[PDB]
Ligand binder design. Structure first.
Ligand SMILES: [Ar]
Ligand SMILES: [Ar]
Ligand SMILES: [Ar]
Ligand SMILES: [Ar]
Ligand SMILES: [Ar]
Ligand SMILES: [Ar]
Ligand SMILES: [Ar]
Ligand SMILES: [Ar]
Ligand SMILES: [Cl-]
Ligand SMILES: [Cl-]
Ligand SMILES: [Cl-]
Ligand SMILES: [Cl-]
Ligand SMILES: [Cl-]
Ligand SMILES: [Cl-]
Ligand SMILES: [Cl-]
Ligand SMILES: [Cl-]
Ligand SMILES: [Cl-]
Ligand SMILES: [Cl-]
Ligand SMILES: [Cl-]
Ligand SMILES: [Cl-]
Ligand code: NA
Length: 129
């Protein structure tokens, strides 16, 4: 599924991401934009042989099982395929664990490089939330 901007903002808010670990909703919508272009089906292989999955490009090195990342963990206790669903529940719940782990939203390279320190409220402006 390719979300609209306000459609995703609404889904993220409903699942409790808005101000989660003090990150305003615009930070999460901005991260999703530059990680996946709001596409739940997005995948990207990493140099180390891990893969990033879903609208927030969550990595199989630590967070989910894909059966093809030897030595890796599955800290969200999910198949990586759960992160590719039209339903964002699994991505939101796993993101909550990631952003809780000490490094906040710096876990998302696109957030650090393209969202952090920018006008992230722009990503929810006009949305009826
Ligand atoms: Ar779609
Ligand atoms: Ar997919
Ligand atoms: Ar596993
Ligand atoms: Ar799993
Ligand atoms: Ar699952
Ligand atoms: Ar799945
Ligand atoms: Ar998400
Ligand atoms: Ar990570
Ligand atoms: Cl699509
Ligand atoms: Cl929308
Ligand atoms: Cl957009
Ligand atoms: Cl909704
Ligand atoms: Cl507060
Ligand atoms: Cl915001
Ligand atoms: Cl992609
Ligand atoms: Cl594996
Ligand atoms: Cl694990
Ligand atoms: Cl699994
Ligand atoms: Cl959803
Ligand atoms: Cl933080
Ligand atoms: Na894994």
């Amino acid at each position: 599924k390719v979300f609209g901007r306000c459609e995703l903002a609404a889904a993220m808010k409903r699942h409790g991401l808005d101000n989660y670990r003090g990150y305003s909703l615009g930070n999460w919508v901005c991260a999703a934009k530059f990680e996946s272009n709001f596409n739940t089906q997005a995948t990207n292989r990493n140099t180390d042989g891990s893969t990033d999955y879903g609208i927030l490009q969550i990595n199989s090195r630590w967070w989910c099982n894909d059966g093809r990342t030897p030595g890796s963990r599955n800290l969200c206790n999910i198949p990586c395929s759960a992160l590719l669903s039209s339903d964002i529940t699994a991505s939101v719940n796993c993101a909550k664990k990631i952003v809780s782990d000490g490094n906040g939203m710096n876990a998302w390279v696109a957030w650090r490089n393209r969202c952090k320190g920018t006008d992230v409220q722009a990503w929810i402006r006009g949305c009826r939330l």
